[PDB]
mmCIF file of N, CA and C in Angstrom:
data_model
loop_
_atom_site.group_PDB
_atom_site.id
_atom_site.type_symbol
_atom_site.label_atom_id
_atom_site.label_comp_id
_atom_site.label_asym_id
_atom_site.label_seq_id
_atom_site.Cartn_x
_atom_site.Cartn_y
_atom_site.Cartn_z
ATOM 1 N N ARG A 1 8.544 53.416 60.110
ATOM 2 C CA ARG A 1 9.241 54.167 59.074
ATOM 3 C C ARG A 1 8.309 54.574 57.941
ATOM 4 N N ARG A 2 7.211 53.842 57.738
ATOM 5 C CA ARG A 2 6.257 54.197 56.694
ATOM 6 C C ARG A 2 5.413 55.409 57.068
ATOM 7 N N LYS A 3 5.050 55.553 58.341
ATOM 8 C CA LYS A 3 4.185 56.642 58.776
ATOM 9 C C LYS A 3 4.939 57.945 59.012
ATOM 10 N N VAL A 4 6.266 57.947 58.868
ATOM 11 C CA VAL A 4 7.024 59.181 59.053
ATOM 12 C C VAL A 4 6.614 60.213 58.010
ATOM 13 N N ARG A 5 6.458 59.783 56.756
ATOM 14 C CA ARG A 5 6.069 60.703 55.694
ATOM 15 C C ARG A 5 4.658 61.246 55.884
ATOM 16 N N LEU A 6 3.820 60.570 56.669
ATOM 17 C CA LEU A 6 2.471 61.062 56.909
ATOM 18 C C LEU A 6 2.518 62.430 57.576
ATOM 19 N N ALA A 7 1.663 63.339 57.104
ATOM 20 C CA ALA A 7 1.643 64.689 57.656
ATOM 21 C C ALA A 7 1.165 64.701 59.101
ATOM 22 N N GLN A 8 0.350 63.724 59.493
ATOM 23 C CA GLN A 8 -0.172 63.646 60.852
ATOM 24 C C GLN A 8 0.405 62.424 61.552
ATOM 25 N N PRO A 9 1.413 62.574 62.419
ATOM 26 C CA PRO A 9 1.926 61.406 63.146
ATOM 27 C C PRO A 9 1.056 61.038 64.337
ATOM 28 N N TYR A 10 0.347 59.916 64.237
ATOM 29 C CA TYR A 10 -0.472 59.416 65.331
ATOM 30 C C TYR A 10 -0.425 57.895 65.325
ATOM 31 N N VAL A 11 -0.501 57.314 66.521
ATOM 32 C CA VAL A 11 -0.429 55.869 66.695
ATOM 33 C C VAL A 11 -1.574 55.427 67.595
ATOM 34 N N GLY A 12 -2.080 54.223 67.332
ATOM 35 C CA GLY A 12 -3.204 53.688 68.077
ATOM 36 C C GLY A 12 -2.884 52.400 68.807
ATOM 37 N N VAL A 13 -2.973 52.433 70.134
ATOM 38 C CA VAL A 13 -2.693 51.282 70.986
ATOM 39 C C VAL A 13 -4.018 50.703 71.459
ATOM 40 N N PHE A 14 -4.157 49.387 71.354
ATOM 41 C CA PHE A 14 -5.338 48.671 71.810
ATOM 42 C C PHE A 14 -4.969 47.760 72.978
ATOM 43 N N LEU A 15 -5.953 46.987 73.434
ATOM 44 C CA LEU A 15 -5.789 46.070 74.558
ATOM 45 C C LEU A 15 -6.161 44.669 74.090
ATOM 46 N N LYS A 16 -5.176 43.776 74.046
ATOM 47 C CA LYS A 16 -5.420 42.409 73.609
ATOM 48 C C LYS A 16 -6.335 41.682 74.588
ATOM 49 N N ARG A 17 -7.130 40.760 74.053
ATOM 50 C CA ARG A 17 -7.950 39.896 74.884
ATOM 51 C C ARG A 17 -7.082 38.825 75.541
ATOM 52 N N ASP A 18 -7.681 38.100 76.481
ATOM 53 C CA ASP A 18 -6.952 37.070 77.205
ATOM 54 C C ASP A 18 -6.410 36.019 76.240
ATOM 55 N N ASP A 19 -5.510 35.181 76.755
ATOM 56 C CA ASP A 19 -4.845 34.152 75.958
ATOM 57 C C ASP A 19 -4.041 34.788 74.821
ATOM 58 N N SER A 20 -3.062 35.602 75.212
ATOM 59 C CA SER A 20 -2.245 36.313 74.239
ATOM 60 C C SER A 20 -1.560 35.338 73.291
ATOM 61 N N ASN A 21 -1.612 35.655 71.996
ATOM 62 C CA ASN A 21 -0.989 34.814 70.975
ATOM 63 C C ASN A 21 -0.701 35.707 69.769
ATOM 64 N N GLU A 22 0.569 36.084 69.597
ATOM 65 C CA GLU A 22 0.923 36.952 68.479
ATOM 66 C C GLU A 22 0.617 36.291 67.142
ATOM 67 N N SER A 23 0.643 34.957 67.087
ATOM 68 C CA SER A 23 0.197 34.272 65.879
ATOM 69 C C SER A 23 -1.267 34.581 65.596
ATOM 70 N N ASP A 24 -2.107 34.561 66.632
ATOM 71 C CA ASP A 24 -3.498 34.968 66.462
ATOM 72 C C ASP A 24 -3.599 36.447 66.110
ATOM 73 N N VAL A 25 -2.777 37.286 66.745
ATOM 74 C CA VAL A 25 -2.843 38.723 66.494
ATOM 75 C C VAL A 25 -2.575 39.017 65.024
ATOM 76 N N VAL A 26 -1.527 38.411 64.463
ATOM 77 C CA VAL A 26 -1.252 38.592 63.041
ATOM 78 C C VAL A 26 -2.322 37.913 62.192
ATOM 79 N N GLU A 27 -2.824 36.757 62.631
ATOM 80 C CA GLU A 27 -3.799 36.016 61.842
ATOM 81 C C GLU A 27 -5.196 36.612 61.970
ATOM 82 N N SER A 28 -5.738 36.652 63.185
ATOM 83 C CA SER A 28 -7.072 37.178 63.435
ATOM 84 C C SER A 28 -6.957 38.497 64.182
ATOM 85 N N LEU A 29 -7.516 39.555 63.599
ATOM 86 C CA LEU A 29 -7.517 40.871 64.220
ATOM 87 C C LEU A 29 -8.622 41.036 65.255
ATOM 88 N N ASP A 30 -9.616 40.146 65.264
ATOM 89 C CA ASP A 30 -10.736 40.265 66.189
ATOM 90 C C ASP A 30 -10.332 40.046 67.641
ATOM 91 N N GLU A 31 -9.238 39.322 67.890
ATOM 92 C CA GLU A 31 -8.817 39.064 69.264
ATOM 93 C C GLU A 31 -8.723 40.360 70.059
ATOM 94 N N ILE A 32 -8.142 41.399 69.458
ATOM 95 C CA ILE A 32 -7.952 42.656 70.167
ATOM 96 C C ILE A 32 -9.303 43.233 70.569
ATOM 97 N N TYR A 33 -9.327 43.929 71.705
ATOM 98 C CA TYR A 33 -10.561 44.528 72.192
ATOM 99 C C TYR A 33 -10.976 45.703 71.311
ATOM 100 N N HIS A 34 -12.273 46.018 71.357
ATOM 101 C CA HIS A 34 -12.792 47.134 70.574
ATOM 102 C C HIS A 34 -12.209 48.460 71.048
ATOM 103 N N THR A 35 -12.091 48.642 72.361
ATOM 104 C CA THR A 35 -11.576 49.894 72.898
ATOM 105 C C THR A 35 -10.130 50.108 72.469
ATOM 106 N N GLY A 36 -9.790 51.363 72.181
ATOM 107 C CA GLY A 36 -8.451 51.722 71.766
ATOM 108 C C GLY A 36 -8.119 53.132 72.204
ATOM 109 N N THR A 37 -6.884 53.542 71.922
ATOM 110 C CA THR A 37 -6.398 54.864 72.297
ATOM 111 C C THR A 37 -5.462 55.367 71.210
ATOM 112 N N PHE A 38 -5.865 56.434 70.529
ATOM 113 C CA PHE A 38 -5.044 57.079 69.515
ATOM 114 C C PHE A 38 -4.384 58.314 70.111
ATOM 115 N N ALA A 39 -3.103 58.499 69.812
ATOM 116 C CA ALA A 39 -2.335 59.585 70.409
ATOM 117 C C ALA A 39 -1.194 59.955 69.468
ATOM 118 N N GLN A 40 -0.272 60.773 69.969
ATOM 119 C CA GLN A 40 0.834 61.314 69.194
ATOM 120 C C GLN A 40 2.109 60.537 69.497
ATOM 121 N N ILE A 41 3.084 60.639 68.598
ATOM 122 C CA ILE A 41 4.403 60.057 68.828
ATOM 123 C C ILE A 41 5.370 61.172 69.199
ATOM 124 N N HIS A 42 6.065 61.003 70.324
ATOM 125 C CA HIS A 42 6.938 62.048 70.850
ATOM 126 C C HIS A 42 8.327 61.994 70.219
ATOM 127 N N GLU A 43 9.022 60.868 70.365
ATOM 128 C CA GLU A 43 10.374 60.757 69.836
ATOM 129 C C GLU A 43 10.802 59.297 69.836
ATOM 130 N N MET A 44 11.416 58.871 68.734
ATOM 131 C CA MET A 44 12.012 57.546 68.650
ATOM 132 C C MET A 44 13.437 57.582 69.187
ATOM 133 N N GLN A 45 13.801 56.555 69.957
ATOM 134 C CA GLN A 45 15.122 56.474 70.568
ATOM 135 C C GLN A 45 15.946 55.325 70.002
ATOM 136 N N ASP A 46 15.446 54.093 70.095
ATOM 137 C CA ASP A 46 16.121 52.915 69.549
ATOM 138 C C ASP A 46 17.610 52.913 69.896
ATOM 139 N N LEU A 47 17.905 52.879 71.197
ATOM 140 C CA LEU A 47 19.296 52.882 71.641
ATOM 141 C C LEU A 47 19.888 51.477 71.609
ATOM 142 N N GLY A 48 19.328 50.565 72.400
ATOM 143 C CA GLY A 48 19.846 49.213 72.479
ATOM 144 C C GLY A 48 19.180 48.281 71.490
ATOM 145 N N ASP A 49 17.878 48.459 71.294
ATOM 146 C CA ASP A 49 17.110 47.695 70.327
ATOM 147 C C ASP A 49 16.554 48.634 69.266
ATOM 148 N N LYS A 50 16.306 48.081 68.079
ATOM 149 C CA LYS A 50 15.800 48.876 66.969
ATOM 150 C C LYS A 50 14.357 49.319 67.172
ATOM 151 N N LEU A 51 13.676 48.815 68.201
ATOM 152 C CA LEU A 51 12.290 49.177 68.483
ATOM 153 C C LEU A 51 12.144 49.397 69.984
ATOM 154 N N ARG A 52 12.063 50.661 70.393
ATOM 155 C CA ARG A 52 11.910 51.061 71.790
ATOM 156 C C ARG A 52 10.838 52.137 71.908
ATOM 157 N N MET A 53 9.677 51.893 71.308
ATOM 158 C CA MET A 53 8.709 52.968 71.122
ATOM 159 C C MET A 53 8.048 53.346 72.446
ATOM 160 N N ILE A 54 8.167 54.622 72.817
ATOM 161 C CA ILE A 54 7.487 55.184 73.981
ATOM 162 C C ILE A 54 6.037 55.443 73.595
ATOM 163 N N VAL A 55 5.107 54.993 74.433
ATOM 164 C CA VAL A 55 3.685 54.998 74.114
ATOM 165 C C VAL A 55 2.927 55.754 75.197
ATOM 166 N N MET A 56 2.047 56.659 74.761
ATOM 167 C CA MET A 56 1.123 57.394 75.614
ATOM 168 C C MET A 56 -0.295 57.186 75.108
ATOM 169 N N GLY A 57 -1.253 57.196 76.031
ATOM 170 C CA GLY A 57 -2.660 57.171 75.677
ATOM 171 C C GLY A 57 -3.293 58.532 75.870
ATOM 172 N N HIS A 58 -3.762 59.143 74.783
ATOM 173 C CA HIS A 58 -4.308 60.494 74.818
ATOM 174 C C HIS A 58 -5.790 60.544 74.483
ATOM 175 N N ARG A 59 -6.193 59.982 73.346
ATOM 176 C CA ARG A 59 -7.581 60.029 72.891
ATOM 177 C C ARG A 59 -8.148 58.614 72.942
ATOM 178 N N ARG A 60 -8.885 58.314 74.007
ATOM 179 C CA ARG A 60 -9.570 57.034 74.116
ATOM 180 C C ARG A 60 -10.740 56.983 73.140
ATOM 181 N N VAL A 61 -11.119 55.768 72.748
ATOM 182 C CA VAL A 61 -12.211 55.586 71.800
ATOM 183 C C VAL A 61 -12.707 54.153 71.904
ATOM 184 N N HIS A 62 -13.955 53.939 71.490
ATOM 185 C CA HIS A 62 -14.581 52.618 71.459
ATOM 186 C C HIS A 62 -15.168 52.422 70.065
ATOM 187 N N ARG B 1 -0.466 72.588 73.060
ATOM 188 C CA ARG B 1 -0.938 71.230 72.816
ATOM 189 C C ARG B 1 -1.939 71.186 71.668
ATOM 190 N N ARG B 2 -2.621 72.302 71.400
ATOM 191 C CA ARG B 2 -3.581 72.339 70.301
ATOM 192 C C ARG B 2 -2.879 72.325 68.948
ATOM 193 N N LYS B 3 -1.736 73.003 68.841
ATOM 194 C CA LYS B 3 -1.027 73.107 67.572
ATOM 195 C C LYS B 3 -0.188 71.877 67.253
ATOM 196 N N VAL B 4 -0.111 70.905 68.163
ATOM 197 C CA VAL B 4 0.662 69.697 67.891
ATOM 198 C C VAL B 4 0.118 68.988 66.657
ATOM 199 N N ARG B 5 -1.206 68.967 66.503
ATOM 200 C CA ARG B 5 -1.840 68.282 65.385
ATOM 201 C C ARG B 5 -1.897 69.126 64.117
ATOM 202 N N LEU B 6 -1.468 70.384 64.168
ATOM 203 C CA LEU B 6 -1.499 71.230 62.982
ATOM 204 C C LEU B 6 -0.553 70.697 61.914
ATOM 205 N N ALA B 7 -0.980 70.803 60.654
ATOM 206 C CA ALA B 7 -0.119 70.395 59.549
ATOM 207 C C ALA B 7 1.143 71.246 59.497
ATOM 208 N N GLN B 8 1.008 72.553 59.730
ATOM 209 C CA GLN B 8 2.132 73.488 59.765
ATOM 210 C C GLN B 8 2.232 74.074 61.168
ATOM 211 N N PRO B 9 3.027 73.470 62.057
ATOM 212 C CA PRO B 9 3.203 74.054 63.394
ATOM 213 C C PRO B 9 4.096 75.284 63.372
ATOM 214 N N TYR B 10 3.526 76.442 63.694
ATOM 215 C CA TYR B 10 4.262 77.696 63.742
ATOM 216 C C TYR B 10 3.862 78.458 64.996
ATOM 217 N N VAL B 11 4.762 79.323 65.458
ATOM 218 C CA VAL B 11 4.504 80.164 66.621
ATOM 219 C C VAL B 11 4.995 81.573 66.324
ATOM 220 N N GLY B 12 4.170 82.563 66.666
ATOM 221 C CA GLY B 12 4.556 83.948 66.516
ATOM 222 C C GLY B 12 5.244 84.492 67.753
ATOM 223 N N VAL B 13 5.763 85.710 67.618
ATOM 224 C CA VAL B 13 6.382 86.432 68.721
ATOM 225 C C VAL B 13 6.130 87.913 68.496
ATOM 226 N N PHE B 14 5.558 88.576 69.490
ATOM 227 C CA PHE B 14 5.236 89.991 69.422
ATOM 228 C C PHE B 14 5.979 90.729 70.530
ATOM 229 N N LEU B 15 5.699 92.023 70.652
ATOM 230 C CA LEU B 15 6.372 92.870 71.627
ATOM 231 C C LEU B 15 5.343 93.744 72.323
ATOM 232 N N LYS B 16 5.439 93.832 73.645
ATOM 233 C CA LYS B 16 4.540 94.681 74.409
ATOM 234 C C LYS B 16 5.126 96.080 74.543
ATOM 235 N N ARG B 17 4.243 97.073 74.571
ATOM 236 C CA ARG B 17 4.664 98.445 74.798
ATOM 237 C C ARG B 17 4.944 98.657 76.284
ATOM 238 N N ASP B 18 5.166 99.911 76.665
ATOM 239 C CA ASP B 18 5.361 100.237 78.068
ATOM 240 C C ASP B 18 4.054 100.020 78.829
ATOM 241 N N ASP B 19 4.083 100.302 80.131
ATOM 242 C CA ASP B 19 2.959 100.009 81.016
ATOM 243 C C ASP B 19 2.632 98.515 80.969
ATOM 244 N N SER B 20 3.668 97.709 81.195
ATOM 245 C CA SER B 20 3.528 96.260 81.120
ATOM 246 C C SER B 20 2.378 95.792 82.001
ATOM 247 N N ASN B 21 1.424 95.090 81.392
ATOM 248 C CA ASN B 21 0.216 94.680 82.101
ATOM 249 C C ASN B 21 -0.374 93.474 81.384
ATOM 250 N N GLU B 22 -0.258 92.293 81.997
ATOM 251 C CA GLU B 22 -0.886 91.107 81.424
ATOM 252 C C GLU B 22 -2.404 91.237 81.437
ATOM 253 N N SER B 23 -2.945 91.960 82.421
ATOM 254 C CA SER B 23 -4.378 92.231 82.428
ATOM 255 C C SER B 23 -4.783 93.010 81.185
ATOM 256 N N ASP B 24 -3.956 93.972 80.769
ATOM 257 C CA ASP B 24 -4.212 94.663 79.511
ATOM 258 C C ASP B 24 -3.976 93.752 78.313
ATOM 259 N N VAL B 25 -3.047 92.799 78.424
ATOM 260 C CA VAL B 25 -2.822 91.861 77.327
ATOM 261 C C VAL B 25 -4.083 91.048 77.067
ATOM 262 N N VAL B 26 -4.708 90.546 78.136
ATOM 263 C CA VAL B 26 -5.966 89.824 77.979
ATOM 264 C C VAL B 26 -7.113 90.769 77.646
ATOM 265 N N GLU B 27 -7.032 92.031 78.071
ATOM 266 C CA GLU B 27 -8.079 93.017 77.824
ATOM 267 C C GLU B 27 -7.808 93.832 76.565
ATOM 268 N N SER B 28 -6.682 94.542 76.531
ATOM 269 C CA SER B 28 -6.337 95.436 75.431
ATOM 270 C C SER B 28 -5.323 94.746 74.526
ATOM 271 N N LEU B 29 -5.798 94.216 73.398
ATOM 272 C CA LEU B 29 -4.889 93.707 72.380
ATOM 273 C C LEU B 29 -4.003 94.809 71.814
ATOM 274 N N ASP B 30 -4.402 96.073 71.974
ATOM 275 C CA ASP B 30 -3.605 97.189 71.479
ATOM 276 C C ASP B 30 -2.233 97.258 72.138
ATOM 277 N N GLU B 31 -2.060 96.621 73.299
ATOM 278 C CA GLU B 31 -0.761 96.645 73.965
ATOM 279 C C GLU B 31 0.309 95.993 73.101
ATOM 280 N N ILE B 32 -0.032 94.881 72.449
ATOM 281 C CA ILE B 32 0.933 94.153 71.637
ATOM 282 C C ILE B 32 1.384 95.023 70.471
ATOM 283 N N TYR B 33 2.686 95.011 70.196
ATOM 284 C CA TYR B 33 3.219 95.803 69.097
ATOM 285 C C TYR B 33 2.844 95.179 67.761
ATOM 286 N N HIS B 34 2.591 96.037 66.772
ATOM 287 C CA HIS B 34 2.226 95.548 65.448
ATOM 288 C C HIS B 34 3.408 94.877 64.759
ATOM 289 N N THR B 35 4.630 95.290 65.081
ATOM 290 C CA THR B 35 5.806 94.580 64.601
ATOM 291 C C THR B 35 5.904 93.223 65.286
ATOM 292 N N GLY B 36 6.344 92.213 64.537
ATOM 293 C CA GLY B 36 6.428 90.873 65.077
ATOM 294 C C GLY B 36 7.388 90.009 64.288
ATOM 295 N N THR B 37 7.552 88.774 64.758
ATOM 296 C CA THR B 37 8.419 87.806 64.094
ATOM 297 C C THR B 37 7.852 86.415 64.327
ATOM 298 N N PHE B 38 7.601 85.686 63.247
ATOM 299 C CA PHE B 38 7.075 84.331 63.324
ATOM 300 C C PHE B 38 8.201 83.324 63.127
ATOM 301 N N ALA B 39 7.970 82.090 63.572
ATOM 302 C CA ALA B 39 9.008 81.075 63.478
ATOM 303 C C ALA B 39 8.388 79.689 63.565
ATOM 304 N N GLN B 40 9.204 78.691 63.236
ATOM 305 C CA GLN B 40 8.842 77.298 63.439
ATOM 306 C C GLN B 40 9.157 76.884 64.872
ATOM 307 N N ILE B 41 8.492 75.829 65.328
ATOM 308 C CA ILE B 41 8.692 75.331 66.683
ATOM 309 C C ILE B 41 9.768 74.254 66.670
ATOM 310 N N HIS B 42 10.636 74.275 67.683
ATOM 311 C CA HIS B 42 11.726 73.307 67.774
ATOM 312 C C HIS B 42 11.311 72.053 68.541
ATOM 313 N N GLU B 43 10.963 72.205 69.818
ATOM 314 C CA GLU B 43 10.611 71.066 70.658
ATOM 315 C C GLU B 43 10.200 71.586 72.029
ATOM 316 N N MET B 44 9.402 70.783 72.731
ATOM 317 C CA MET B 44 8.934 71.094 74.077
ATOM 318 C C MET B 44 9.608 70.148 75.065
ATOM 319 N N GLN B 45 10.149 70.705 76.151
ATOM 320 C CA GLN B 45 10.851 69.925 77.166
ATOM 321 C C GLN B 45 10.135 69.939 78.512
ATOM 322 N N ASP B 46 9.891 71.118 79.079
ATOM 323 C CA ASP B 46 9.221 71.256 80.372
ATOM 324 C C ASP B 46 9.974 70.494 81.465
ATOM 325 N N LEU B 47 11.212 70.927 81.715
ATOM 326 C CA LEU B 47 12.027 70.283 82.741
ATOM 327 C C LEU B 47 11.409 70.458 84.123
ATOM 328 N N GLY B 48 11.378 71.694 84.619
ATOM 329 C CA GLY B 48 10.850 71.969 85.942
ATOM 330 C C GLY B 48 9.517 72.684 85.913
ATOM 331 N N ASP B 49 9.345 73.587 84.952
ATOM 332 C CA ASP B 49 8.106 74.326 84.776
ATOM 333 C C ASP B 49 7.276 73.687 83.672
ATOM 334 N N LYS B 50 5.967 73.593 83.914
ATOM 335 C CA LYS B 50 5.067 72.966 82.955
ATOM 336 C C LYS B 50 5.117 73.624 81.585
ATOM 337 N N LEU B 51 5.462 74.907 81.510
ATOM 338 C CA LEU B 51 5.526 75.632 80.245
ATOM 339 C C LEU B 51 6.933 76.188 80.075
ATOM 340 N N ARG B 52 7.664 75.651 79.098
ATOM 341 C CA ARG B 52 9.002 76.129 78.740
ATOM 342 C C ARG B 52 9.108 75.999 77.221
ATOM 343 N N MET B 53 8.765 77.072 76.511
ATOM 344 C CA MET B 53 8.673 77.045 75.057
ATOM 345 C C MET B 53 9.793 77.878 74.452
ATOM 346 N N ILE B 54 10.437 77.337 73.425
ATOM 347 C CA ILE B 54 11.518 78.025 72.731
ATOM 348 C C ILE B 54 10.941 78.777 71.541
ATOM 349 N N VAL B 55 11.261 80.065 71.463
ATOM 350 C CA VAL B 55 10.843 80.932 70.372
ATOM 351 C C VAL B 55 12.085 81.430 69.645
ATOM 352 N N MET B 56 11.918 81.672 68.346
ATOM 353 C CA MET B 56 13.009 81.979 67.437
ATOM 354 C C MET B 56 12.629 83.164 66.561
ATOM 355 N N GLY B 57 13.649 83.799 65.990
ATOM 356 C CA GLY B 57 13.436 84.827 64.992
ATOM 357 C C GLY B 57 13.655 84.278 63.599
ATOM 358 N N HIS B 58 12.565 84.018 62.879
ATOM 359 C CA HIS B 58 12.622 83.366 61.576
ATOM 360 C C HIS B 58 12.126 84.262 60.454
ATOM 361 N N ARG B 59 10.983 84.920 60.637
ATOM 362 C CA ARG B 59 10.380 85.771 59.612
ATOM 363 C C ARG B 59 9.876 87.041 60.290
ATOM 364 N N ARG B 60 10.587 88.145 60.081
ATOM 365 C CA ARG B 60 10.176 89.438 60.608
ATOM 366 C C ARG B 60 9.030 90.007 59.780
ATOM 367 N N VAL B 61 8.189 90.816 60.425
ATOM 368 C CA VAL B 61 7.033 91.401 59.757
ATOM 369 C C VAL B 61 6.632 92.679 60.480
ATOM 370 N N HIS B 62 6.133 93.638 59.704
ATOM 371 C CA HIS B 62 5.616 94.909 60.206
ATOM 372 C C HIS B 62 4.122 94.946 59.895
#
């Protein structure tokens, strides 16, 4: 909801390292791999759950 | 797909004269009528055909 006002809607998905731990993810950002993918947001749905984000990978980066 | 990242996404609409010829469209820009109408973009669907774009009459121009 914060990035809606941004003139450029883009989202970046990364790849977590082994031993997934959301506590580590929130605590230490280094766990996530360097490689990532920035792309566009198509449409929010949130039918059954308030977060149902459809994700595409368009611009890979390291 | 190039205009998706534009701050102001807009699409024009022109009119071809007689002797309809896409080869002339790519060759002779003179085929396109100087009268036109620009508009904002609504959304892209592409149900069966890869290209299905909706155009509107928003701002007429001579």
